[PDB]
Amino acid sequence: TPADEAREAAVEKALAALDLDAKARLLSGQDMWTLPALPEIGLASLVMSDGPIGVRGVRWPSVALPSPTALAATWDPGLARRAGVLLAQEARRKGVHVLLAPTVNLHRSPLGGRHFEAYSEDPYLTGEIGSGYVTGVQAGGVGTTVKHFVANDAETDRFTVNNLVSARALRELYLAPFEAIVANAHPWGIMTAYNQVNGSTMTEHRYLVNEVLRGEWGFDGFNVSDWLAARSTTGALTGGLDVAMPGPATVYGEPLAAAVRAGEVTESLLDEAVRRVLRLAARVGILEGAAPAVTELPAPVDGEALAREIARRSFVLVRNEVAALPLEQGATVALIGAAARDARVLGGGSATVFPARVVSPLDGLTAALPEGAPTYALGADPNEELAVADTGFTLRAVCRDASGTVIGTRSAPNGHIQGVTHATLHSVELTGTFTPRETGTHTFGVKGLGAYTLTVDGTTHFDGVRTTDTDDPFVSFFGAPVPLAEVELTEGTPLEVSLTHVVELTMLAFSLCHQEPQRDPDELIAEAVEAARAADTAVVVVATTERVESEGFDRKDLRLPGRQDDLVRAVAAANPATVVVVNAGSPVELPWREDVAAVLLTWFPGQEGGAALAEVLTGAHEPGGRLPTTWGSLTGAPVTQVTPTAGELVYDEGVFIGYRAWDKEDRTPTYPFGHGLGYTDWTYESLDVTGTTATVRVRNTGTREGRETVQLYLAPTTADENRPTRWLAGFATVEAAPGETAEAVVRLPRRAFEIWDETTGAWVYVTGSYEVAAGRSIADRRTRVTIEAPK
């Protein structure tokens, strides 16, 4: 803390200069993304933006990386550090100061909405990756808000739900990754969640925010509310909140200025909170008078290359039978499935961005394979009932005032929408022309809320409203699009399409949606089976959509959308050498494993996914992924409750989530935590533990050079009603050529032996004999040793 002392001196001078009206103003938001500026003290407007896979800015493109679970499947916090560096470069370019990322809530249930956005079901692996990600983002002088503090491991009724979580459960599981990132990475900020934990809402939670996070862990950054989570001027200030950031009319500002002057809300409390915001201002560099934390920035990073590297390093090859992968030299390959032509690179929610261009599996494999590239056949379409209007749509974004007079025309990206306009703007048209690809009944819709008027070819097909009873307006926007009208358009012949939204009195975004005309599912699977029959290997890319996987709501089942499961079985029957490329962000049921030759989980693999998949399938590279979460059937899954009964979600499983819960119940999953295969064999030959330092020698006993994640699992020798049977206590990714041997000196944290004392309010190093085991997964433990926990 050498320059930090000088920096915190400039913060104190700035705090002293400001008056009560400016102090309360600063803590209140200005726009959807930025805070007010104060030239009286040389402070610029703090720009904040989403998020985990890419930086959006203020919608005025981004680099779309693979989903957060994909980054965690690489088991490499050095990759997460590099990922963070690129994101800081993106933020510096888009003028963003704070990145609203990473999400580190655990994978409690497989039905969780933002499951694709979290890293793992294990708090150690989550903390390690999160630590790397934050250190990397802040390495480029860009702030981070570790979201969603704490216990936001489900989306239904997230606005009000009371998540009743145990004392040990919070300390050992849900809070762990936050403590790990606070201590290791030193984050400049945090975000408090919409839900409540044991009574208090996270934004108003005095015990967890001020006493635990700040008091025990020594957090020195700012605490932003989740967008619309701030709901009390006095309740949030006293509960450790600093910034009510939903938008312009926040709970802070003039209501807070008044509460200080009139009520028993002390100006000392306001001063303590502004001090935190002004400390952030100095680190991100928006405050003149305090030098920025990172002055010399990290060397430029190639965004496309890192997106490909993270993508292939995460692909978990769970199944591979005799050797389906990699593909053989000069083999006839057939690509099947809609997800191969139109890939799903991002998951739904605020984490979405628009990349420059996306490489699809068919684009990638066409270039990778020679003359007579993959024979493509769409097997089934998962992206229905509706999808954003893009293919064949040439749209503009017209702004109108009260008199309907045009006051601007922005270029439409495709259908979504959010210049020299202001409170005068009354409505927003989204006109254009649409050339249909095939004749039939085209449906048109919208994903938005409020007043809408649709006119496909002059005729006003819709002119009504779209209200909803839900407690959260964010659930409403990213909900499935609503069909407004069916229309008969002949292919080739285009017509003038138009969708207007009237705006007046938070709510400010809509998108034109369109469904391609009817396609028989059974005939689609018939034409794909002919291609499966006409090939040495069939590659079926199966995927969950942004409508299935998204924020605001939870999934209903782990089954694949559309007739995709029925497509896989038809292809597996016609051709035995079938490779299923699962492009899903969360666990999904694989009922046809026994029939298919191979399975490869690719998550939502970012804009370069198609290039990484082409490299892996052809054998240019190896799939370097190892499950960061336990995959299995929903019936076998022991912790699935996402829905709150009587407005309460009890976490009855306690300290047992993910693999810990499967062990406690005897239920064995389809593929366990840490499972994954590459394109080479690994023989663990030596394990030496000295105190708490495990040293592992592993041999590449395969035909090709490859990577291996060494996974150390601690397990008490005695019975453990109080604890899980085994748990991850360390890991390390090593690379070696065939025959060559690599070592791994992995130190197990002191914490791996400790448990939480609810009464003392302290950690308890559990003494006794343990079994430290090195392996390829939890189920594939290769070598064991018995040690006494050191003093």
Numbering used by the authors: 10 to 69, 74 to 335, 340 to 435, 444 to 530, 537 to 822
Question: Any passages from the paper?
Answer:
We obtained the crystallographic structure of BcpE2 at 3.09 Å. The crystal belongs to the P3121 space group with one molecule in the asymmetric unit. Six regions could not be built because of a lack of electron density: the first nine amino acids (AA), the 12 C-terminal residues, which consist of a His6-Tag and a linker, and four loops (residues 70 to 73, 336 to 339, 436 to 443 and 531 to 536). In addition, a 60 AA linker is present between (α/β)6-sandwich and the fibronectin type III-like domains and mostly runs on the (β/α)8 TIM barrel domain. The two catalytic residues – Asp239 and Glu582 – were strictly conserved in all homologous GH3s. The PA14 domain of BcpE2 was also characterized by B factor values significantly higher than the rest of the protein, particularly in the active site vicinity, indicating the likely flexibility of this domain. The BcpE2 structure revealed two features likely contributing to its broad substrate specificity, i.e., (i) a wide cavity in the PA14 domain connected to the d-glucose specific subsite (−1), and (ii) the high flexibility of this domain, especially the structure elements defining this cavity.
Here, we revealed that the BglC compensating enzyme BcpE2 was the GH3-family beta-glucosidase that displayed the highest reported substrate promiscuity and was able to release the glucose moiety of all tested types of plant-derived heterosides (aryl β-glucosides, monolignol glucosides, cyanogenic glucosides, anthocyanosides, and coumarin heterosides). The exceptional substrate promiscuity of BcpE2 provides microorganisms a versatile tool for scavenging glucose from plant-derived nutrients that widely vary in size and structure. In this work, we reported the structural and biochemical characterization of BcpE2, a GH3-family β-glucosidase of the common scab phytopathogen S. scabiei.
